[PDB]
Design a binder for this molecule. Structure first.
Ligand code: CLA
Ligand code: CLA
Ligand code: CLA
Ligand code: CLA
Ligand code: CLA
Ligand code: CLA
Ligand SMILES: CCCCCCCCCCCCCCCCCC(=O)OC[C@H](CO[C@@H]1O[C@H](CO)[C@H](O)[C@H](O)[C@H]1O)OC(=O)CCCCCCCCCCCCCCCCC
Ligand SMILES: CCCCCCCCCCCCCCCCCC(=O)OC[C@H](CO[C@@H]1O[C@H](CO)[C@H](O)[C@H](O)[C@H]1O)OC(=O)CCCCCCCCCCCCCCCCC
Ligand SMILES: CC1=C(/C=C/C(C)=C/C=C/C(C)=C/C=C/C=C(C)/C=C/C=C(C)/C=C/C2=C(C)CCCC2(C)C)C(C)(C)CCC1
Ligand SMILES: CC1=C(/C=C/C(C)=C/C=C/C(C)=C/C=C/C=C(C)/C=C/C=C(C)/C=C/C2=C(C)CCCC2(C)C)C(C)(C)CCC1
Ligand SMILES: CCCCCCCCCCCCO[C@@H]1O[C@H](CO)[C@@H](O[C@H]2O[C@H](CO)[C@@H](O)[C@H](O)[C@H]2O)[C@H](O)[C@H]1O
Ligand code: OEX
Ligand SMILES: [Cl-]
Ligand SMILES: [Fe+2]
Lengths: 35, 32, 82, 137, 335, 340, 447
């Protein structure tokens, strides 16, 4: 079949995927903070 | 008075248990 | 049992996907990392740094005590080098 | 709100003279305090004798005075009762009893000074917490 | 007579009994009857019990000032500990009732019978040619009773610390437990509520989905239940219409279409979750408690920055500090 | 008409069904989950509770939380553009603005979600017994996260969104409300525990009364997705439980409705009890018990024991749990048993 | 060879029920994993091991197992030479490669079945003769092993005896209790408070002696099963299938798993408090000791001291009259220990020995065990759930006991599961009720 690319599913998936990794990167950096 | 009331209800539940088990509606197959 | 969307299996398997996402996925990661490591996150959410919970001597808590003049009261708490 | 060298300035001896520890000594002391003290002296108390704590004030009214580096260090070698009228090295960890308390074998004079410093720095930071027990947890 | 014993074995094993008294039943029925009779009599008329062995009798029976909610059967004395205390171990019944004698008689008989009850749930399944493993599902609630009535007392070194047989007495067991073990901060317990919440969730899930996708065979003013006859050939609900709905609620592949894969999950989730919660009490019976994040996060100077974990600790202290007033003589609670 | 064209698009069968409900559901639901995940990692609770509550401060998955606003706020909606935050975002965060954000948004998210159930059911043409059931989780959220603090002094005494922050909410209700002694709560657990039993027992019953529809041992494949005959022997199941338990089902339609009733009814009862706790109309005591306990120093029940535990909880927790009260409890006034 | 047309993927290992060859590879590859762990872990423990520091404060569970056998230790459990630890570790780790080799080989190269490639090693589950024979083989192998312990104890060095006359030390046992009345007496002992059944063993003489009996009896039954077949009843009672045999061994391990849990938690002898931590009762006993010691030095008369309840602050009586420690520790009046026994008299704790025979080594022993009770958190924070972070510690007795209970339990489930299937497999309905011939439909209605 000739499937499309940008779809409603694509949008949804990205609304969760994009912030997640951005957070996973942020939290990963926190593991080195100290005092 | 209170003790009596508590045991009474309890005795009533146990009585129910009996009738529920041995005096139920016979579960009939297909032709029901 | 099917709809318009392109079967995930194909996409997660397609070389084109990875050619894209080998760039995109790490990019967001490094971005989130920088968001913290540059101390920006601290200012965006007013979260105190390890050396910004109390004043040097003070051992009291900066508890907000009134709703309307809260924002003003909060700023006053940052004043005392907190 | 940080561990300044202003905080790490603790009395060295009875004659008012003081000493200034370093963030390296503190951490090292804190670690050593966990290694050979925390077992019974967790959070400045004394599990096997709650009547005597590690409060600076309590150490001050000790006999001899144990509210300074020199005091504590001596104690860690030859410990005594609160009046000092009796040596208790046999039932208390010390250098002259390292055969009985293996943990004290490794410990060298550098370690002793660090541990001593830790006991004096903690109340400066924690305050009432360091002295009291579950009440202040 | 073909043979008395042979007939006897045939009556026991008989699948034509109203209640299947099995071989496990031969042990179950007497033990359960002893347990329940002693319980009922105790709960009503038993005298106060010195649970903590400190000569401080706790009355938990109706006739002695209690009601259903407060009333309970008080655990054996702490002076007895893990010692075996049958009736024939006491100078008199008066002494036996004072030292929490009934408690042991009940829990031992119950746990024994309740175990045989599981064994019977296999036997009947065997005699009826159906698959076993139903008893395996019952192993989870049973393992909890075992953990609460036997494992924890063994670990703690006394039956006086086993869960009391009553409403309020059960609340006491929990509050104190939380203080000494911080059970809320333990993974196994968390898995427990996960199974229990999930259970109730899924029970409502399945329940609703099925009953909502019933094939119409009833009148507008007639009970929708009558649209089913005991002993049907075909199904009474459209599982394909059910899957169609739930498949659209979330998304297709996150929805069941296999009734067998469904009911397995329906059974697996709660049983496994409760299994862990049973292992939780059994693990914390040897003082392997929940996470201790007290005074974890501290600031740059060393000051203690509190968390919700600390707020929990304060509540825990209050329970610890106040439980069993006159029972303690020494600083540490190690027993 | 544009409407029916808008409808057409929305009600299109996609991978993730949108629908009219989706216009309400997805925005809120996403912001609610997002707001939590945001605060969980970044925003603090220092200025509101004197607490660290984020990964950024050092909290872990258990100790993290989106804490309630200060008691000063009252029942304020705490709008970003409201008199408190005054458009400021950073201030808004520090005043616990994210709590009312998550709460109110999530609340509408639960409204949209049930609407989705209603909307999808109608389309598929199935009965809305999935929407009726979902009312129980609604009542709980409404009663606990909204109604309860609305009866108290402020949002501050509502359950904070977080693992540990919920555990103290439990212990609080014990210490202060004696929540376990409440009949409505008892019905609650009776429904959940009994519901978690029905779930277990029914699944196990079915899997172990199945017919043989295949030649393999893994009987999972041997199921007919297209209805036809019953996949498990309902008749055998009946006789089983009738002999081991004495009572047994014999009407799948009732059995499954029962699986709906029990857990939904329970949560509803637990809701009412909480609604009463808002006005502090709790089930704390038994007057008959206290009166004898006063006159008679030798009368002791497991009920009296528990109340002593409550006094300890209240006394030792209140100071750091209610900062706004500036509590100061001298060591000598703290209720304590012996030695401990 | 084997795929979906036999079992499901998540039940894969059940496809090997009738593949003796490959089914041997598994057991040999698996056995390598056990040797691998034992080896690699010992070296891991040693690599972190600190000599001048208690073993229980270092999270050791294998090195203290070696210490018990009299290896690398001396007076009072003092660690002398760490070489035997290193050896036991590396030797195992090596043997894991050897076993692992055969495991891999038999599972992917060697004959997929054994019956043809060797009629001696090949077997049939229903072959009651081969089964009891293979069982007979292992019954001897285990039997010799039981004597391997006896040898180490009597000849090759001995064991660590905490009850040692001059104080805990490695002692050569040269007088094993062989009296059957005494030995088998333990089996007739109660499992409750006081009479402690098997766990109540309190001297190495019985330990070594008991193992002598077990060693002989095991090999004796080993020979018996080689040269025989199951009787009449033995055949009409059990189920004879590959799964059935598994189930029997599953419940067996489960039972042993529970016994081991109570052993490491209660027993003092075969689990030395010098290498492991102090047992639960021991630590609570120590606290009573400690403060009895303290306050007495302050001039308090412990004998007549009256506590809050009026029961006896420091000393009270047991239900049978013996003088015991006071407080909540009344539940642990069944505790026996080297440090405490010299204070005990013919009627329990002697007030005279308590008054002036208290030794310094006992006071600090009590203090030690008191501040090292088996109390801790999952994240390893020693003390009560309300304690503060500082002392990173959780008694090895706690780790072992909890771990082995979970395993023991799940194995009891594994038992029920595999025994329930075997009964249904044999009779032949483990795959569903026969649609045609439905048994229930042939039984009269009880209604
Ligand atoms: C449909 C989805 C939806 C819904 C129902 C809500 C609902 C809400 N949001 Mg919200 N939000 C959404 C999507 C949604 N949001 C999205 C997608 C975002 C991301 C941009 C946000 C971001 C967001 C933030 C950042 C905040 C909210 C907040 C709020 C709450 C208060 C807002 C308020 O006062 O409403 C006002 C209601 C209206 C404006 C509706 C008016 C409709 C009429 C018909 C239009 C009339 C206009 C006309 C000029 C009037 C003329 C009259 C004349 C006299 C002048 C409320 C629960 C606040 C909150 O949670 O506080 C704690 C808050 O601070 N929202
Ligand atoms: C001596 C021990 C032993 C042996 C030899 C077997 C042998 C067998 N079992 Mg088994 N079983 C045992 C103990 C044992 N069992 C115990 C104690 C239980 C109770 C839990 C079970 C429960 C059980 C079930 C429920 C089933 C079997 C089945 C089987 C058969 C197929 C094997 C299989 O499914 O592998 C497949 C193996 C897996 C899918 C791996 C499972 C992984 C586990 C669940 C997780 C372990 C957690 C781990 C410690 C954490 C690691 C962390 C991770 C991040 C790395 C096979 C004959 C199956 C069968 O066909 O029955 C005859 C079957 O359905 N067993
Ligand atoms: C103790 C763990 C263990 C062991 C020993 C085995 C052993 C076995 N399984 Mg198995 N299995 C296990 C766990 C285990 N399983 C678990 C947990 C699951 C669930 C996921 C399964 C699921 C499963 C299925 C579904 C099947 C098996 C099968 C088999 C058998 C054939 C293996 C095969 O196909 O080779 C294939 C081998 C390879 C593809 C290469 C793997 C590389 C090797 C084996 C490992 C090397 C080890 C090490 C790194 C090398 C050291 C070398 C050194 C000594 C020099 C074999 C006896 C099959 C069977 O029934 O046999 C016909 C089969 O169909 N298993
Ligand atoms: C089973 C026996 C056993 C026992 C009693 C111990 C005991 C110990 N180990 Mg150890 N270990 C074991 C097996 C065991 N280990 C194995 C098999 C391995 C190989 C992976 C290791 C590897 C290992 C290392 C690398 C280290 C230890 C350490 C330690 C010590 C510290 C304990 C700790 O912090 O763990 C805490 C561990 C946990 C809290 C994890 C609990 C995991 C549970 C069991 C998961 C259960 C979930 C369940 C399976 C989910 C399945 C359900 C699903 C199917 C639905 C302690 C003495 C440490 C040490 O010596 O330092 C002092 C250390 O560094 N162990
Ligand atoms: C559970 C253990 C076990 C068992 C039952 C078998 C069984 C078998 N193996 Mg074998 N094997 C094993 C472990 C085992 N293996 C290990 C660990 C390895 C890796 C080194 C191998 C490597 C291996 C190879 C490479 C081959 C076999 C083969 C065979 C088969 C032919 C018999 C044979 O070679 O023996 C012949 C040897 C003897 C009869 C005598 C050996 C005695 C040894 C030297 C002493 C063992 C001492 C022992 C540890 C202590 C016991 C004494 C105690 C009672 C006091 C047979 C089915 C062959 C095969 O596939 O043929 C079908 C084959 O080519 N095996
Ligand atoms: C683990 C090793 C092992 C295993 C698996 C077996 C397995 C078997 N043996 Mg056995 N045996 C062994 C070791 C072993 N033996 C040893 C070491 C000896 C030497 C003493 C013997 C001597 C022996 C004889 C003399 C006979 C067997 C027989 C049998 C077979 C039937 C067993 C049976 O029906 O018992 C079922 C047991 C009962 C119905 C009795 C139950 C009552 C028990 C004992 C008491 C309650 C147990 C309780 C829960 C545990 C508490 C402990 C207790 C001390 C208080 C079976 C294949 C018989 C056979 O068929 O001959 C080939 C037979 O006549 N065995
Ligand atoms: C509101 C809902 C918001 C949904 C947002 C989109 C979610 C995206 C999920 C995609 C997953 C997917 O499609 O299934 C991935 C695969 C389905 O595989 C499907 O196969 C199809 C074959 O034609 C196509 O290839 C699809 O693209 C492919 O997704 O998973 C399934 O088999 C079932 C998944 C059910 C997952 C339920 C959640 C449980 C998650 C487990 C995590 C615990 C650890
Ligand atoms: C061992 C012996 C064990 C004795 C167990 C006693 C069982 C109690 C029987 C309860 C009565 C059952 C009944 O009325 O429903 C009897 C009915 C059986 O009849 C049902 O009738 C329905 C309406 O037509 C449908 O047709 C069902 O198919 C049909 O089975 O059972 C149910 O449907 C209800 C199932 C749930 C049963 C209640 C659980 C009992 C919990 C008791 C807790 C109370 C404890 C009080 C303690 C004080
Ligand atoms: C607030 C706010 C907002 C919002 C925002 C958002 C919306 C965000 C989002 C966010 C997000 C959305 C985030 C996410 C995150 C995520 C994460 C971070 C995750 C993680 C994960 C993990 C970690 C995992 C884990 C696991 C599990 C769970 C299971 C098992 C396994 C594992 C381990 C894997 C706005 C702007 C509108 C406005 C203003 C305010
Ligand atoms: C069958 C199968 C399987 C399994 C497998 C197995 C189980 C294996 C095993 C394996 C093994 C079991 C292996 C072993 C190995 C070992 C080794 C190889 C060793 C080595 C050693 C050495 C080398 C030593 C040396 C040393 C020393 C002495 C010290 C120092 C250091 C060192 C370490 C170096 C699986 C599941 C996967 C899959 C399916 C099939
Ligand atoms: C459905 C309803 C959804 C409504 C969502 C509204 C979200 C936007 O909310 C809007 O946020 C902006 C900042 O972004 C606030 O804006 C505020 O900060 C800006 C600077 O950042 C100031 O210049 C401004 O005067 C002040 O109001 C608005 O006061 C608020 O109305
Ligand atoms: O009992 Mn109930 O409470 Ca388990 O802990 Mn110790 O003993 Mn008593 O004290 Mn706490
Ligand atoms: Cl209490
Ligand atoms: Fe169902």
């Amino acid at each position: 079949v000739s499937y499309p690319i940008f779809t409603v599913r694509w949008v949804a998936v990205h609304t969760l995927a994009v912030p997640t990794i951005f957070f996973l990167g942020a939290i990963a950096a926190m593991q080195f903070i100290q005092r | 008075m209170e003790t009596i009331t508590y045991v009474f209800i309890f005795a009533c539940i146990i009585a129910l248990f009996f009738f529920a088990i041995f005096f139920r509606e016979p579960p009939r197959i297909t032709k029901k | 049992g099917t709809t318009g969307e392109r079967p995930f299996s194909d996409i997660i398997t397609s070389v084109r996907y990875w050619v894209i996402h080998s760039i995109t996925i790490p990019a967001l990661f490094i971005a989130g990392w920088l968001f913290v490591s540059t101390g920006l996150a601290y200012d965006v959410f007013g979260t105190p740094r390890p050396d910004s919970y109390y004043a040097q001597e003070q051992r009291s808590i900066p508890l907000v005590t009134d709703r309307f003049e809260a924002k003003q009261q909060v700023e006053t708490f940052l004043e005392q080098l907190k | 709100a940080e561990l300044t060298p202003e905080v790490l300035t603790v009395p060295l001896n009875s004659e008012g003279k003081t000493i200034t520890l370093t963030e390296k000594q503190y951490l090292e002391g804190k670690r050593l305090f966990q290694y050979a003290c925390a077992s019974c002296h967790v959070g400045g108390i004394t599990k096997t004798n709650p009547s005597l704590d590690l409060r600076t004030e309590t150490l001050a009214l000790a006999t001899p005075p144990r509210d300074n580096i020199e005091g504590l260090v001596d104690y860690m070698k030859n410990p005594t009762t609160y009046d000092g009228e009796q040596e208790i090295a046999e039932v208390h960890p010390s250098l002259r009893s390292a055969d009985i308390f293996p943990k004290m074998r490794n410990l060298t004079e550098k370690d002793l000074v660090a541990i001593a410093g830790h006991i004096l720095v903690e109340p400066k930071i924690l305050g009432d917490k360091w002295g009291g027990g579950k009440v202040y947890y | 007579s073909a043979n008395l014993w042979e007939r006897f074995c045939n009556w026991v094993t008989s699948t034509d009994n109203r209640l299947y008294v099995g071989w496990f039943g031969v042990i179950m029925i007497p033990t359960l009857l002893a347990a329940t009779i002693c319980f009922v009599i105790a709960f009503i008329a038993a005298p106060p019990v010195d649970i903590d062995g400190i000569r401080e009798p706790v009355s938990g029976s109706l006739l002695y000032g209690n009601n259903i909610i407060t009333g309970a059967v008080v655990p054996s004395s702490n002076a007895i500990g893990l010692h075996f205390y049958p009736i024939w171990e006491a100078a008199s019944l008066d002494e036996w009732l004072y030292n929490g004698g009934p408690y042991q008689l009940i829990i031992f008989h119950f746990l024994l019978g309740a175990s045989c009850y599981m064994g019977r749930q296999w036997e009947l399944s065997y005699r009826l040619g159906m698959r076993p493993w139903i008893c395996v599902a019952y192993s989870a609630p049973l393992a909890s009773a075992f953990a609460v009535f036997l494992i924890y007392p063994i670990g703690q070194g006394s039956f006086s610390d086993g869960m009391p047989l009553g409403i309020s007495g059960t609340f006491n067991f929990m509050i104190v437990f939380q203080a000494e073990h911080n059970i809320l901060m333990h993974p196994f317990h968390q898995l427990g509520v996960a199974g229990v919440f999930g259970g109730a969730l899924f029970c409502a899930m399945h329940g609703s989905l099925v009953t909502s996708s019933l094939i119409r065979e009833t009148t507008e003013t007639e009970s929708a239940n009558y649209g089913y006859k005991f002993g049907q050939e075909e199904e009474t609900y459209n599982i394909v219409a059910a899957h169609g709905y739930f498949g659209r609620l979330i998304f297709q592949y996150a929805s069941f279409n296999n009734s067998r894969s469904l009911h397995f999950f329906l059974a697996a989730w709660p049983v496994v979750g409760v299994w862990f919660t049973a292992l939780g009490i059994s693990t914390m019976a040897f003082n392997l408690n929940g996470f201790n994040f007290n005074h974890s996060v501290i600031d740059a100077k060393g000051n203690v920055i509190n968390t919700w974990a600390d707020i929990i600790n304060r509540a825990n202290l209050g329970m610890e500090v106040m439980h069993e007033r006159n029972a303690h003589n020494f600083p540490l609670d190690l027993a | 008409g544009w409407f029916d064209i808008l409808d057409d698009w929305l009600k299109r069968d996609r991978f993730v069904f949108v629908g009219w409900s989706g216009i309400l559901l997805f925005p809120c639901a996403y912001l609610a989950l997002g707001g939590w995940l945001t605060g969980t990692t970044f925003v603090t609770s220092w200025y509101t509770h004197g607490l660290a509550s984020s990964y950024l401060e050092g909290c872990n998955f258990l100790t993290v939380a989106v804490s309630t606003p200060a008691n000063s706020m009252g029942h304020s909606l705490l709008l970003l553009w409201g008199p408190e935050a005054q458009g400021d975002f950073t201030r808004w965060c520090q005043l616990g603005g994210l709590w009312t954000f998550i709460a109110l948004h999530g609340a509408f998210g639960l409204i949209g979600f049930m609407l989705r159930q209603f909307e999808i059911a109608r389309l598929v043409g199935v009965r809305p017994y999935n929407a009726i059931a979902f009312s129980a989780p609604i009542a709980v959220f409404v009663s606990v996260f909204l109604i309860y603090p609305l009866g108290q002094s402020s949002w501050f005494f509502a359950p904070s969104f977080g693992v540990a922050a919920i555990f103290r909410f439990l212990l609080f209700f014990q210490g202060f409300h004696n929540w376990t002694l409440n009949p409505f709560h008892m019905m609650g657990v009776a429904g959940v525990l009994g519901g978690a039993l029905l779930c277990a027992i029914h699944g196990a019953t079915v899997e172990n009364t199945l017919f043989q529809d295949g030649e393999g041992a893994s009987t999972f494949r041997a199921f007919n997705p297209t209805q036809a005959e019953e996949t498990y022997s309902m008749v055998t199941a009946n006789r089983f439980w009738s002999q081991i338990f004495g009572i047994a089902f014999s009407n799948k339609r009732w059995l499954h409705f029962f699986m709906l009733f029990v857990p939904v009814t329970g949560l509803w009862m637990s809701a009412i009890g909480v609604v009463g706790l808002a006005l502090n109309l709790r089930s704390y005591d038994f007057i008959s018990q206290e009166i004898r306990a006063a006159e008679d120093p030798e009368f002791e029940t497991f009920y009296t024991k528990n109340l002593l535990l409550n006094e300890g909880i209240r006394a030792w927790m209140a100071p750091q749990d209610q900062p706004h009260e500036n509590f100061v409890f001298p060591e000598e006034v703290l209720p304590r048993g012996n030695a401990l | 060879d084997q795929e979906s047309s036999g079992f499901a993927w998540w039940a894969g290992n059940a496809r090997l029920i009738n593949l003796s060859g490959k089914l041997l590879g598994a057991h040999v590859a698996h056995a390598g994993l056990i040797v691998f762990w034992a080896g690699a872990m010992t070296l891991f423990e040693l690599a972190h091991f600190i000599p001048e520091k208690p073993m229980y404060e270092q999270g050791l569970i294998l090195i203290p197992h070696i210490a018990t056998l009299g290896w690398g230790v001396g007076p009072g459990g003092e660690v002398v030479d760490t070489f035997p630890f290193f050896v036991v570790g590396v030797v195992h780790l090596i043997s894991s490669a050897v076993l692992g080799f055969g495991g891999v080989y038999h599972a992917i190269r060697g004959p997929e079945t054994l019956e043809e490639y060797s009629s001696f090693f090949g077997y049939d589950w229903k072959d009651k003769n081969k089964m009891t024979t293979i069982l007979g083989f292992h019954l001897i192998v285990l039997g010799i092993g039981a004597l391997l312990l006896v040898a180490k104890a009597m000849f090759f060095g001995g064991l660590y005896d905490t009850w040692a006359p001059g104080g805990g030390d490695v002692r050569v046992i040269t007088n094993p209790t062989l009296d059957p009345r005494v030995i088998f007496g333990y089996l007739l002992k109660s499992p409750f408070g006081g009479e402690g059944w098997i766990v109540s063993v309190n001297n190495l003489e019985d330990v070594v002696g008991g193992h002598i009996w077990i060693g002989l009896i095991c090999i004796a039954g080993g020979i018996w099963h080689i040269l025989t077949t199951p009787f009449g009843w033995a055949r009409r009672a059990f189920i004879w299938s590959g799964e059935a045999y598994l189930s029997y061994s599953l419940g067996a391990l489960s039972m042993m798993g529970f016994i081991a849990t109570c052993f490491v938690w209660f027993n003092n002898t075969v689990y030395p408090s010098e290498f492991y931590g102090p047992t639960g009762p021991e630590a609570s006993q120590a606290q009573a000791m400690t403060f009895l010691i303290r306050d007495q030095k302050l001039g308090a008369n412990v004998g007549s001291a009256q506590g809050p309840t009026g029961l006896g602050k420091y000393l009270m009586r047991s239900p049978t009259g013996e003088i015991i420690f006071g407080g909540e520790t009344m539940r642990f009046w069944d505790f026996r220990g080297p440090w405490l026994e010299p204070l005990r008299g013919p009627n329990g704790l002697d007030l005279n020995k308590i008054k002036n025979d208290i030794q310094p080594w006992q006071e600090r022993r009590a203090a030690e065990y008191m501040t090292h009770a088996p109390l801790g958190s999952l994240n390893s924070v020693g003390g009560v759930a309300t304690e503060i972070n500082s002392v990173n510690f959780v008694s090895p007795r706690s780790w072992l006991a909890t771990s082995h209970f979970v395993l023991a339990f799940f194995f009891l489930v594994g038992h029920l599961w595999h025994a329930g299937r075997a009964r249904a497999a044999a009779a032949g309905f483990e795959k569903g009720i026969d649609r045609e011939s439905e048994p229930v439909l042939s039984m009269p209605s009880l209604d």
